[PDB]
Amino acid sequence: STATLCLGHHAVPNGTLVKTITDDQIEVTNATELVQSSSTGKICNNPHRILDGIDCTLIDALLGDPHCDVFQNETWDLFVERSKAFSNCYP
Amino acid sequence: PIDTCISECITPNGSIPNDKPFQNVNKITYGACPKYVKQNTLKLATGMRNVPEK
Amino acid sequence: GFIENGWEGMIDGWYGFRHQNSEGTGQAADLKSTQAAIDQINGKLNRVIEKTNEKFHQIEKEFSEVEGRIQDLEKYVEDTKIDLWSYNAELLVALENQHTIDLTDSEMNKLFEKTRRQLRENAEDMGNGCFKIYHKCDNACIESIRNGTYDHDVYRDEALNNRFQ
Amino acid sequence: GFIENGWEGMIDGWYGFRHQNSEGTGQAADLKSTQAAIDQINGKLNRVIEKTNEKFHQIEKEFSEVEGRIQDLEKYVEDTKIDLWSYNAELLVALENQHTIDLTDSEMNKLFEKTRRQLRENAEDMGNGCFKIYHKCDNACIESIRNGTYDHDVYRDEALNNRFQ
Amino acid sequence: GFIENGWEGMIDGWYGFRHQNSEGTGQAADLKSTQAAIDQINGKLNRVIEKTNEKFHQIEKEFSEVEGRIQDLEKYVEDTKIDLWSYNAELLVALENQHTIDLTDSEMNKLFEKTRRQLRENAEDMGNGCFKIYHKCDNACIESIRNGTYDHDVYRDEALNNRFQ
Ligand SMILES: *[C@@H]1O[C@H](CO)[C@@H](O[C@@H]2O[C@H](CO)[C@@H](O)[C@H](O)[C@H]2NC(C)=O)[C@H](O)[C@H]1NC(C)=O
Ligand SMILES: *[C@@H]1O[C@H](CO)[C@@H](O)[C@H](O)[C@H]1NC(C)=O
Ligand SMILES: *[C@@H]1O[C@H](CO)[C@@H](O)[C@H](O)[C@H]1NC(C)=O
Ligand SMILES: *[C@@H]1O[C@H](CO)[C@@H](O)[C@H](O)[C@H]1NC(C)=O
Ligand SMILES: *[C@@H]1O[C@H](CO)[C@@H](O)[C@H](O)[C@H]1NC(C)=O
């Protein structure tokens, strides 16, 4: 003689625990990470003009150290300075 | 090590994607990089309160 | 809240209806409220943090030797900026999550109230978020309720008779 | 929301009533809700940013020559402060606008509910934000509704008879 | 709001009931809503500002002589940090107070609505936040209302007869 009409919202079996103003941990249906905590470990060479300084420091490439002769007139957007750079000239 | 790839944000740890607004890799950055924060994770809810059956 | 349970069987949308009448149980999703909530959520971070700013030349942040005053000042500046940005991130995420939760609760309540206003006197709220309608309401009736064009006047007499005898 | 349209002809206040009865259509504004919203809005920025702070002697922010470390540090400090304050301004304005909008919606809903509670059983909510009252309600009746002293008990019998026949 | 007055005689909880029937006036407190509000309030500052950070070696912040550029820079850095943190504190306290007030108002409204839904047709909202129940409701009835297991169906006939005559 009569009908029935229920109302509801979708749920999921497992939810993600987020933090709000009034809760340390509250479970929601979905959540996205906002902090990028991992790196690919390699430097992309575009769109920035990268200059890898092999065994050369910036000052060594500037002054003209022999093993830095290849760095004359170089240009860069980012100069990447390796830990293995060394000086081999007059102290 | 240098690589043949596309990325706008460079850290000493390598290139990272700049789609997220924050990063916890390194405070030394170059390019259109996210801001460095001390927290390694911050989850933003993209759904409703989750009340499952039972 | 008064729904007390979500529907994991609901995959059509976020909010929807489950009806049961003489013909048989049926289920559908309300696209407008789900789409509204998704649209209001789809951004929600580009509207405050427009983008990643672009930094090219900065101070040194790692030191080999020990200089003194200037290295201390550089360390202090970097630490202050890092702490302030961590607080900004924490507070922003907490506020956005709280507001999103309140928003979805309000959207659910708005859908419930809209349905209740369609069924002016023909239905009674059973209190568990589910309406008992007091007249013949077939699948065309139900899809008119879901449509938003439910004509309450033509069932008013039958509904009132069922209610008040 | 359920009002679906604003009233550009309303200049008396922010929220108000438009009534239609046997005598004729009339319009008035509710001063208490409008005044409450305006009062809550009138400040809303002195209560967070008390004032402009007063700065007298600062660092140099424009440089002619190129020094090196110290100029880089000064540029970095100024850029960090500028970025942080821009984020603070952006977030503050977004939050205040969102809260103001929610506040005005809540005030409208509160006025609607107060009116509905004045008309306990004498009126029915038509769903478009407009009440159909089921008894003789003259201009004195309407201004009593607007006043907040509407006596629902003395129309209860007539209203119930009009409703349930 | 629609309660219009607090109860200083209420010490059992934050929100509660005062009933009056044939037996006599009684008062009790609702523990669930008060406990929920207190639980949501009990933290509310550890969830944003986790703790006090630990600073060991910093810059000099008080100077005896006058150096020049570097002392100016140090003063500027300290002043900028102090101003930014003062703004953060001010905004945080204002937002938390506003949200707490809205939260408690919502909890009061939720308790009122839950009670109203228990009394489906047996009671009428008098508009001052107080229900007039239209049937014999003894102390067991009242504590069932407070309990949340009020059986509205078995008083439906008597209540409807009292209401609509
Ligand atoms: C939560 O939202 C995210 C964001 O849309 C969903 O993740 C994406 O889902 C789409 C669906 O096809 C995929 O194409 C994307 O690759 C997903 N992104 C990532 C980063 O994995 C996620 O599925 C949603 N989860 C729930 C339970 O709703
Ligand atoms: C999904 O839910 C199950 C059980 O509820 C849980 O063990 C698991 O961690 C959740 N997440 C995934 C990705 O399976
Ligand atoms: C629903 O209503 C709209 C407009 O009132 C109408 O065009 C449509 O045919 C109806 N039925 C549907 C969408 O099944
Ligand atoms: C409205 O009500 C107040 C108090 O109940 C009364 O003083 C006043 O005369 C009434 N009529 C008005 C303001 O027109
Ligand atoms: C209240 O209800 C609960 C559960 O329905 C029951 O266990 C209890 O005996 C009732 N009476 C009380 C708590 O006085």
Numbering used by the authors:
A (entry chain C): 9 to 99
B (entry chain C): 273 to 326
C (entry chain D), D (entry chain F), E (entry chain B): 8 to 172
Passage from the reporting paper:
HA is a transmembrane viral surface protein which is responsible for interacting with host cell receptors and mediating virus entry. Three HA1/HA2 heterodimers assemble to form a trimer spike protruding from the virus envelope, with the HA2 and the short N- and C-terminal fragments of HA1 forming membrane-proximal stem and the large middle fragment of HA1 forming the membrane-distal head. Through initial biochemistry and cryo-EM data analyses, we found that F005-126, a neutralizing antibody targeting the HA head of H3N2 viruses, fulfills all our requirements.
However, the HA-Fab-pH 5.2 conformations B and C showed significant differences in the stem region from those of the HA-Fab-pH 7.8 and the HA-Fab-pH 5.2 conformation A. The densities of the central helices in the HA-Fab-pH 5.2 conformation B are clearly visible, indicating that the central helix coiled coil is still stable and ordered in the structure. The densities of the fusion peptides in the HA-Fab-pH 5.2 conformation B are largely absent in the hydrophilic pockets of the central helices. These observations suggest that dropping the pH induced the release of the fusion peptides, which was also indicated by the aggregation of the particles. The conformation B has the released fusion peptides while the other domains remain in similar conformation with the neutral pH structure. Of note, the conformation B in our research has not been reported.
